[PDB]
Amino acid sequence: IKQGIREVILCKDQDGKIGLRLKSIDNGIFVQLVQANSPASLVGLRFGDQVLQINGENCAGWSSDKAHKVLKQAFGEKITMTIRDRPFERTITMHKDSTGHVGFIFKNGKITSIVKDSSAARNGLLTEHNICEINGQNVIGLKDSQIADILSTSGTVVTITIMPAFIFEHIIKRMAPSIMKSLMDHTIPEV
């Protein structure tokens, strides 16, 4: 998670798209969806990022409908955005035990218990938190089995990005577990 504000500059694709769905939360604007291989993904916009400004205009108090309309009317050319990185999220770094376990159980991407004497317990992993990212890969809308698979095919050191479940569930209000599973960028970030 980066500590402060950053400017990103986007360019709409040939179809006028940038690959973003935004959501009004607590009088702020937040990234709900980032589409794979979009301008939003390529400039490194992430699920949960806060949008502070678009082309120097404050997003405070905007409806989701209004942020969508402002992105529509913008000269495709070059769109500036001021971003707070994933402000509702934290990253926890854990080590797999000899049997390849960090030490938790989850369901629908929500951590439901912590295993006694595990790296999850030593690192203070919390329950009632949704998994947003594993080693910086978005896993939102993946099957539980696929998240299990991704944890399996990490090395011993696993970084999970977590969000309190209440907040997670207010953000992914309005979007079925098929846009979630199918379109939400899940790609390993490109260099």
Curated annotation (Swiss-Prot):
Protein's GO biological process: actin cytoskeleton organization; chemical synaptic transmission; intracellular signal transduction; negative regulation of receptor internalization; negative regulation of transcription by RNA polymerase II; positive regulation of cell growth; positive regulation of cell migration; positive regulation of cell population proliferation
Entry superkingdom: Eukaryota
Tissue specificity as recorded in UniProt: Expressed in lung cancers, including adenocarcinoma, squamous cell carcinoma and small-cell carcinoma (at protein level). Widely expressed. Expressed in fetal kidney, liver, lung and brain. In adult highest expression in heart and placenta.
Induction context: By IFNG/IFN-gamma in melanoma cells.
Subcellular location: Cell junction, Focal adhesion; Cell junction, Adherens junction; Cell membrane; Endoplasmic reticulum membrane
Effect of residue 143 to A: Disruption of the cooperative binding of C-terminal peptides from FZD7 and phosphatidylinositol-4,5-bisphosphate
GO terms of molecular function: cytoskeletal anchor activity; frizzled binding; identical protein binding; interleukin-5 receptor binding; phosphatidylinositol-4,5-bisphosphate binding; protein heterodimerization activity; protein sequestering activity; syndecan binding
Subunit composition and interactions: Monomer and homodimer. Interacts with SDC1, SDC2, SDC3, SDC4, NRXN2, EPHA7, EPHB1, NF2 isoform 1, TGFA and IL5RA. Interacts with NFASC and PTPRJ. Interacts with SDCBP2. Interacts with PDCD6IP. Forms a complex with PDCD6IP and SDC2. Interacts (via C-terminus) with TGFBR1. Binds to FZD7; this interaction is increased by inositol trisphosphate (IP3). Interacts with SMO.
Name the record gives this protein: Syntenin-1
The organism of origin for this protein: Homo sapiens (Human)
Gene that encodes the chain: SDCBP
Included stretch of the parent chain: 108 to 298 of 298
